[PDB]
Ligand binder design. Structure first.
Ligand SMILES: [Mg+2]
Ligand SMILES: [Mg+2]
Ligand SMILES: [Mg+2]
Ligand SMILES: [Mg+2]
Lengths: 247, 240, 198, 238, 241, 204, 222, 196
């Protein structure tokens, strides 16, 4: 007990609820992401309730824009709906004003703007999820971002959130240099993800995607020069376990 | 346990129980689905000799084909009826065809429903019995404070519900083919008397209504007059 | 329409504005000042729709004076006219536009130079050496194009203007009942009240 | 107590909500066919004064989507209605009939929203939606009060969950596929009742149960009579 | 009447709710701003550290508010961004209306007035930020302003906020000649700043800077938010490895 | 009863090999009566250029509105607005007021600081985009401009020549249009440097 | 304004010219009346230009948001219904007639929507001013089951009809193709019949012909 | 425009042309003027295009939603739904619309919701641009209920002459058979009706 529960200043300055929200975070599933000079990678464990649920119908790394995807750790549901609105705001407040899609930084901030609302206001509990948004845009290049329920956000090189963060954040700290190419990262991701598991380690039980390069195939159309293709790539169950070879 | 919205450590809404608790405490009401149509009856309690008889009606019609009665908190009952009245008349204006009893209940159930969702409001303190006809026969249901209702062969609430219950039990088996429209009334007349024996020191006035394509003619009419008398006397003999 | 003139000179500005008021047939007042000092060094002449006119002017005035004591610092001719244009700009697409034209004369103290802005009811502004709303320009603009020099003394200006007037009288159908003239300079505002005996 | 975070971020009203779903006392199971889908639920009629027609925990949402719910009848009829209309509004606003998996989304979405903004208490019911859409065929998705859905190759809701479950699980490690090999529904039906009887240490008459079948775009509730005939079917063959 | 609610008044006319927030400041990175008869300086020490964090294609302490005005944050990250945004907008309405640059005094005021707003109504908590405003307008020239969450603003000769700003404060009181040209200040900035640190020593990465200056050769005002390099360097100039 | 035709003015732009050009007249006046000869229809937001014809206040209001927004863009994005980007914007902006349209005729042109590609666009009062690779004309004497441009545009001129061409195109069409004139000005946009020039013309 | 669409045995094709008028004047010699709603669903639109564009932009914009959320795929009639519900909600005030066409996980599709909310369907539709010439062409050379080659050949030869006999249309031809299994190819200017002949004289002026009164070097950044 | 619906012994069947004209020009000479709202409930649209089209969409919605809770709806239950829409907005609507549906119990019913909103249950109704010349035939050559094939002719010849004197209405004929059996989709090519 304290002057905690409610949206108001504790004697020092600590804002109440917020911290307990950052608790549903720390308790949640383990997830990471690495920015790597020519690509960026985001991943998280897919701990199945039971083997009767075809977990193959629930994305954890989701597509925000054909240049940006993100991921979470915490309250499943908060992430599901947070995303859809997040997608719309990337439209209504950007694409429909400009004709194109928004850079990483801004979309994040825009998501943060919403993460904000839930706070400054009694009658509404904030979100129990921290997001790892990775992206790219023609002028700022590759980006990595974290977003807490407290609205705030930071720019990372790589990191983790959830149960196995204290640990992972240390393993990653060791294994990082500024010249690593994507496949290096991809590889490195798994090896961190390695420890942080309790269940399995096959394909269908690991959710990972990455921002890489244009996929002229995926479009569906051809005839327009400047319109070349999404960079967001959700690796599927297959492509994975194969990379389990070089450990 | 004190607010209306909240749940107990193992999923329970107490305010609704008390709601139920007050529904029981009030007078007793019943209803019976027979051959074609239905029959209702309630228990007006004459507390003094200064009450004009044949007066304060507790039973109400809806549209021109739905009987309706209840017990527990009287104003709550009346209120609920109004909503049902709009819904009916609005629907009617919209689809032309008088409202199907089956759905009607829901419209009501959905409304009683709401008053279990927010804390700022008070749960409905009445159990309600009703029915009527249409194309595909007559129906009869019974709505409680929880909002949950169903279709019964006959219903009962208020003070002594068991009396009329085991009483309704019998009828089922000896007349497993629906009791006669006529006999339905006079029988209801009795089932009440029997269930009254709690307010025994205090006299009372029985009220009855019914529906039937043969008797009422699709409509809901107040059982008053000649058939009303004999239906009492009928009860008065078996009253021994 | 009425008469609204203005001319920027050396270290001042001059505003002319007819005096008569008409209601269809008869002429009510004929000694009416169509002016409204906004601040110690800013001033505004105007002509427009009967009601629209006098309301808007005072309203603009209000805001300014407000700003000027709030801040305690005075607002620049430039900025003032910007605001006026703002208001009209909105006014024109409002459920009901204030049909009013104006001239704004002020002495920008920081630059130590006199500025003059002409602005129609549509929200059309322009810094000018001199101007006149409505039909007023037609009759005079030439004489100004002719004799005007940026260096003219305050007196030089009056003579010019005086001549423009004599013309407006001579070829204008309407009887404007003369003019009230006023000067804005480093000293502030004063009225050439003498233009009756002059 | 109330709807805003615990000290370990787990706001119990949502947790409490669950027990109540269960508390009703009925068992709901569901499995996929190959060109059909099926759900089992018990139909315990105590009061000898009611009417079994009026009883049920399965309703016809759409021309092809049905729904079963282990939970308190009042709250169910609600969920029933909203959902029932979301699809009604959808077909209109978009040109094509709304699939299983989706409804369950706005549905979970809806229950999430409530929960976070506080505009009402969550309904204490778990909805189990069924049908077959020509994009993913035999579909089965479930939703809970803590606003959340997912997929099942065959599921169960009830006081005795894991029992009904484990059986199927074992029957699945062997059948090895992720559904029920068989062409006729009658036959699948038979199969589930089978896998439930065995799973309760109990027997059911022709009214003690409740079942539904999702076909090639023509969802229908199993009625009293036809229901019995499957018990005929699965008596000797056992 | 104790702690809770902002709409409450303690028996002695105190608004605790505020006094906590107004104090919550003592948790943020040490930001400093100094005035010179030729330029204004904004110095700041970063926080939230680890080893896996960029900061180059971003910042979170020094924000440019107007081509003529700049601010140093020290509070809730989430809060700041909201005000920073509406502070930018309003400043532009001033421009769009008067077609002129918005005066610093005015801008500071309006903001202090929103912070104050949240200080008196139920259903909302005050912002937990503190700002060092630095800018110029031809009305009153160069100006250094500050404001707390209590909604009070202040004209300062040279100020600091955040952590150890009582310690850091006094160091300033010593060395400061009113005319003190800019470089002596930029220098002084670090001197003051170093002295008040829990890091083994002052490393460029964990640090933010910017300055304001104007003249005859520019005819107008130019401000610079220093990029990663310039810093790593000037640091050396003040004698740091 | 046409608004666009009340104040007067024209604007024209062309693309040269590695550069662009845009010029406009100077006149501003209510129908017959000429009022100003110092009214410019071309401004910019950093390295981006906009020429606007049509109704005077609406012109001014637009400039302000755009100056406003570009400042706010460059701020949150730490980079100046790009041409192609601006276009798509001014486009949507015009439309947001599609039932109380602004009576104007904009024309955008510039040089993309990444690709280095010259750019030009034109629009109707509601934001319909006219992407062109040679020239854009808007204003009173629209028709007279197409007559000039069609003869004079030559794919890829040298900046020094392009100037001479556009100057003459503008200059001459302006004399057959009664509502445009009283001076003009032409800008020449190179990768870096930019040259502003006023030219001599009939003052009638 | 002159456009058409014709579906064949495994898809559908829509084509439109490239000229935009303005009363008697030619505004754009090269405009794309063919816009993308989604990868497989595209539109061609006539009448009021700014209307036709912005509207598809809008719809394309939402349909994207939809598919994402639904994790399925864009149905053609989804786009149609979206368009005409909004389209008519503004009783005519938004002149935009168009041939909506694409392919969904259930077949090839082709429709035509009027500016008021009217929608039709057939095997070939023409909208625009020269809708009559291009109609007459299709109403003599059309037979059920045409191929990628037969259909294409036709569509482009219908557009050609308007380009010549109707004033309000001209310059080049724009084409786009959707095949029931394959992708979609945007062929900007499949044809180029109208091309200006080389001019007679060279009109470049000798440097220094234009009189200048002043000059300088304008500012840009801070 | 040229539509109608006729009742008989096995129920009712409604038919109409395909011709739709913008001015003196044929927009789409192959229109599906007969529209489905429910399985055993359809309608034929008259007058305005855009309007009639949208009305239906809405109705189709109401009904397809009615059923999901109140069981299967009547033919009268459907008319009233158009009554509301047509009436409320009589000022921005142009619709001649004829409704028809069948139910085993009350056989098939025919209701006409002409312009204004006035509703009518008649033996059979006829609306549309060219209804004007079949007031002679129809009424005169009308026996009380007929046979499946027997009736198909009223439709056939009523529709035939209407093309013969009213250009704004033509194309092919299309019928929709609503019976106990179910729905049957008819179509009678040109060279046929003309011969008669
Ligand atoms: Mg509540
Ligand atoms: Mg023009
Ligand atoms: Mg001229
Ligand atoms: Mg005909």
């Amino acid at each position: 007990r304290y002057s905690f529960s409610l949206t108001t200043f504790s004697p020092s300055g600590k804002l109440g609820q917020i911290d307990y929200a950052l608790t549903a975070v720390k308790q949640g599933v383990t997830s990471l992401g690495i920015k790597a000079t020519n690509g960026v990678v985001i991943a998280t464990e897919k701990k199945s309730s039971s083997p009767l649920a075809m977990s193959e119908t629930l994305s954890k790394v989701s597509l925000l824009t054909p240049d940006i995807g993100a991921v979470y750790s915490g309250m499943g549901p908060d992430y599901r709906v947070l995303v859809d609105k997040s997608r719309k705001v990337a439209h209504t407040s950007y694409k429909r004003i400009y004709g194109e899609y928004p850079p990483t930084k801004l979309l994040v901030s825009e998501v943060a703007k919403i993460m904000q609302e839930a706070t400054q206001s009694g009658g509404v509990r904030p979100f129990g999820v921290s997001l790892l948004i990775a992206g790219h845009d023609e002028f700022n290049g590759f980006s990595l971002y974290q977003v807490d329920p407290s609205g705030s956000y930071f720019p990372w090189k790589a990191t983790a959130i959830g149960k196995g963060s204290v640990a992972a954040k240390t393993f990653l700290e060791k294994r990082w240099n500024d010249e690593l190419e994507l496949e290096d990262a991809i590889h490195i991701a798994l090896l961190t993800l390695k420890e942080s598991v309790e269940g399995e380690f096959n394909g269908d039980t690991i959710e990972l995607a990455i921002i890489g390069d244009e996929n002229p195939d995926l479009l569906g159309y051809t005839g327009i020069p400047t319109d070349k293709g999404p960079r967001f790539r959700k690796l599927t169950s297959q492509e994975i376990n194969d990379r389990l070879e070089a450990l | 346990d004190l607010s209306n919205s909240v749940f107990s450590p193992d999923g329970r809404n107490f305010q609704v129980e008390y709601a139920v608790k007050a529904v029981e405490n009030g007078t007793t009401s019943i209803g019976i689905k027979c051959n074609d149509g239905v029959v209702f009856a309630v228990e007006k309690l004459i507390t003094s000799k200064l009450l004009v008889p044949q007066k304060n009606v507790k039973i109400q019609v809806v549209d021109r084909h739905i009987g309706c009665v209840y017990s527990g908190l009287i104003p709550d009952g009346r209120h609920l009826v109004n909503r049902g009245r709009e819904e009916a008349a609005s629907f009617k204006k919209l689809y032309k065809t008088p409202i199907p009893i089956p759905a009607f209940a829901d419209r009501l159930g959905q409304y009683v429903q709401a008053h279990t969702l927010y804390n700022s409001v008070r749960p409905f303190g009445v159990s309600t019995i009703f029915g009527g006809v249409d194309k595909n026969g007559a129906h009869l249901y019974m709505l409680e404070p929880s909002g949950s209702y169903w279709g019964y062969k006959g219903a009962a609430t208020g003070k002594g519900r068991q009396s009329a219950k085991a009483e309704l039990e019998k009828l089922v088996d000896h007349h497993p083919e629906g009791l006669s429209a006529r006999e339905a009334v006079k029988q209801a007349a009795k089932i009440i008397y029997l269930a009254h024996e709690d307010n025994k020191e205090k006299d009372f006035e029985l009220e009855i209504s019914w529906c039937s394509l043969s008797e009422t003619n699709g409509l809901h009419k107040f059982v008053k007059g000649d058939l009303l008398q004999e239906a009492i006397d009928f009860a008065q003999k078996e009253i021994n | 329409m009425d008469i609204i003139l203005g001319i920027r000179v050396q270290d001042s500005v001059i505003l002319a504005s007819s005096k008569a008021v008409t209601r269809g047939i008869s002429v009510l007042k004929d000694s009416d000042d169509k002016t409204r000092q906004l601040s110690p060094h800013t001033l505004m002449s105007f002509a427009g729709e009967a009601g629209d006119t006098v309301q808007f002017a005072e309203y603009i005035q209000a805001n300014i004076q407000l700003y000027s004591i709030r801040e305690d610092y005075e607002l620049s001719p430039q900025a003032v006219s910007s605001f006026v244009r703002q208001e009209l700009a909105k006014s024109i697409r409002s459920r009901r536009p204030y049909q009013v034209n104006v001239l704004i004369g002020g002495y920008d103290k920081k630059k130590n130079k006199p500025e003059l802005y002409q602005i129609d009811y549509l929200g059309t502004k322009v810094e000018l050496p001199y101007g006149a709303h409505g039909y007023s320009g037609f009759y005079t603009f030439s004489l100004l194009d002719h004799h005007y020099r940026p260096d003219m003394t305050t007196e030089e200006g009056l003579d010019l203007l005086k001549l423009c007037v004599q013309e407006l009288e001579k070829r204008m159908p309407m009887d404007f009942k003369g003019v009230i003239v006023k000067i804005v300079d480093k000293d502030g505002i004063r009225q050439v009240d003498d233009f009756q005996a002059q | 107590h109330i709807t805003i975070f615990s000290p370990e971020g787990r706001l119990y009203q949502v947790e409490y909500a669950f027990k109540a779903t269960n508390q009703t006392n009925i068992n709901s199971l569901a499995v996929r066919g190959k060109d059909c889908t099926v759900v089992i639920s018990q139909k315990k009629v105590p009061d000898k004064l009611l009417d079994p027609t009026t009883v049920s925990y399965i309703f016809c949402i759409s021309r092809t989507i049905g729904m079963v719910v282990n939970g308190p009848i009042p709250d169910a009829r609600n969920a029933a209605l909203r959902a029932k209309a979301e699809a009604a509004e959808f077909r209109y606003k978009y040109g094509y009939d709304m699939p299983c998996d989706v409804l369950a989304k706005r549905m979970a979405n809806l229950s999430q929203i409530y929960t976070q903004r506080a505009y009402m208490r969550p309904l204490g019911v778990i909805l189990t939606f069924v049908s077959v859409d020509e994009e993913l065929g035999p579909s089965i998705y479930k939703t809970d009060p803590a606003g959340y859905y997912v997929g099942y190759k065959a599921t169960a809701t009830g006081p005795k969950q894991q029992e009904i479950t484990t059986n199927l699980e074992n029957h699945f490690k062997k059948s090895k596929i992720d559904h029920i090999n068989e062409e006729s529904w009658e036959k699948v039906v038979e199969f589930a009742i089978t896998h439930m009887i065995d799973a309760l240490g109990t027997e059911f008459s022709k009214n003690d149960l409740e079942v539904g079948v999702a076909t090639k775009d023509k969802f229908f509730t199993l009625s009293a009579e036809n229901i019995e005939e499957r018990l005929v079917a699965i008596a000797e063959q056992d | 009447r104790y702690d809770s609610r902002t709409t409450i008044f303690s028996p002695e006319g105190r608004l605790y709710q505020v006094e906590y927030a107004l104090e919550s400041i003592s948790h943020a990175g040490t930001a400093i701003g100094i005035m010179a008869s030729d330029g204004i300086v904004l110095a700041a020490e970063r926080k939230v550290t680890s080893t896996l964090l960029e900061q180059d294609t971003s910042t979170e302490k020094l924000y440019k508010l107007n081509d003529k005005i700049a601010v140093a944050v020290a509070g809730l990250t989430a809060d700041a961004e909201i005000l920073i945004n509406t502070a930018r907008i309003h400043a532009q309405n001033y421009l769009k209306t008067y077609n002129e640059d918005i005066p610093v005094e005015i801008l500071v005021r309006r903001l202090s007035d929103i912070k104050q707003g949240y200080t008196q109504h139920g259903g909302l908590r005050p912002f937990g930020v503190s700002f060092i405003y630095a800018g110029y307008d031809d009305r009153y020239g160069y100006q250094l302003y500050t404001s707390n969450p209590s909604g009070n603003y202040t004209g300062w000769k040279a100020i600091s906020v955040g952590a150890n700003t009582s310690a850091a404060q006094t160091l300033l009181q010593m060395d400061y000649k009113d005319d003190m040209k800019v470089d002596d200040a930029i220098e002084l900035a670090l001197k003051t700043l170093s002295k008040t640190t829990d890091s083994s020593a002052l490393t460029y990465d964990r640090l933010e800077f910017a300055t304001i200056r104007k003249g005859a050769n520019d005819g107008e005002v130019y401000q610079k938010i220093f990029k990663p390099q310039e810093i790593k360097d000037i640091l050396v100039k003040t004698g740091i490895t | 009863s046409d608004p666009s035709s009340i104040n007067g003015g024209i604007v024209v732009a062309m693309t040269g090999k590695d550069c662009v050009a845009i010029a406009c007249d100077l006149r501003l006046g209510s129908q017959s009566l000429g009022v100003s000869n110092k009214f410019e229809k071309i401004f910019h937001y950093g390295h981006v250029f906009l020429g606007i014809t049509g109704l005077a206040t609406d012109v001014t209001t637009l400039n302000e509105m755009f100056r406003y927004k570009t400042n706010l863009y460059k701020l949150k994005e730490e980079r100046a607005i790009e041409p192609e980007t601006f276009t798509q914007l001014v486009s949507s902006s015009l439309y947001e007021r599609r039932f109380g349209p602004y009576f104007v005729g904009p024309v955008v042109a510039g040089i993309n600081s990444k690709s280095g590609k010259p750019f030009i666009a034109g629009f109707d009062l509601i934001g319909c985009i006219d992407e062109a690779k040679d020239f854009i004309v808007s204003g009173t004497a629209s028709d007279q401009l197409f007559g000039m441009c069609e003869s004079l545009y030559e794919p890829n001129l040298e900046p020094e020549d392009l100037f001479e061409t556009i100057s003459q195109a503008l200059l001459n069409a302006a004399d057959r249009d009664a509502l445009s004139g009283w001076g003009a000005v032409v800008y020449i946009i190179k990768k870096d440097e930019v040259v502003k020039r006023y030219l001599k013309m009939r003052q009638d | 304004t002159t456009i058409v669409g014709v579906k064949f045995n495994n898809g559908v094709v829509i084509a439109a010219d490239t000229r935009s008028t303005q009363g008697p004047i030619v505004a754009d010699k090269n405009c794309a009346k063919l816009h993308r709603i989604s990868p497989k669903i595209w539109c061609a639109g006539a009448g009021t230009a700014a209307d036709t564009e912005a509207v598809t932009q809008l719809i394309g914009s939402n349909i994207e948001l939809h598919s994402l959320y639904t994790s399925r795929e864009p149905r053609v009639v989804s786009a149609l219904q979206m368009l005409k519900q909004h389209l008519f909600k503004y009783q005519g005030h938004i002149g935009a007639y168009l041939i909506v066409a694409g392919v969904d996980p259930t077949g090839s599709h082709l429709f035509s929507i009027h500016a008021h909310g009217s929608t039709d369907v057939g095997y070939y539709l023409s909208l625009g001013s020269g809708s009559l010439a291009a109609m007459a062409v299709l109403e003599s050379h059309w037979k059920q089951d045409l191929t990628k080659e037969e259909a294409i050949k036709l569509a482009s030869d219908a557009i050609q009809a308007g380009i010549w006999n109707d004033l309000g249309s001209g310059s080049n031809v724009d084409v786009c193709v959707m095949e029931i299994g394959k992708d979609a190819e945007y062929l900007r200017n499949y044809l180029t019949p109208n091309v200006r002949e080389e001019k007679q004289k060279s009109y470049k002026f000798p440097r220094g012909t234009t009189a200048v009164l002043k000059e300088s070097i304008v500012n840009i950044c801070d | 425009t040229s539509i109608m619906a006729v009742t008989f012994k096995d129920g009712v069947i409604l038919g109409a042309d395909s011709r739709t004209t913008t001015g003196a020009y044929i927009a789409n000479r192959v229109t599906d003027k007969l529209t489905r709202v429910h399985d055993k409930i359809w309608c034929c649209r008259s007058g305005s295009a855009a309007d009639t089209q949208a009305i239906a969409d809405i109705v189709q919605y109401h009904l397809e939603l009615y059923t999901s809770q109140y069981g299967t709806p009547s033919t009268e239950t459907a008319a009233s739904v158009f009554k509301e829409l047509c009436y409320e907005n009589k000022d921005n609507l142009t619709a001649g619309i004829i409704v028809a549906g069948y139910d085993d119990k009350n056989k098939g019913e025919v209701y006409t919701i002409p312009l204004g909103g006035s509703v009518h249950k008649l033996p059979y109704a006829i609306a549309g641009s060219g209804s004007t010349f079949i007031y002679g035939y129809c009424d005169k050559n009308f026996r009380e209920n007929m046979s499946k094939e027997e009736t198909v002719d009223f439709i056939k010849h009523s529709l035939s002459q209407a093309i013969k004197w009213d250009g704004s209405s033509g194309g092919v004929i299309r019928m929709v058979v609503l019976t106990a059996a179910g729905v049957e989709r008819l179509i009678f090519y040109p060279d046929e009706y003309e011969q008669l």
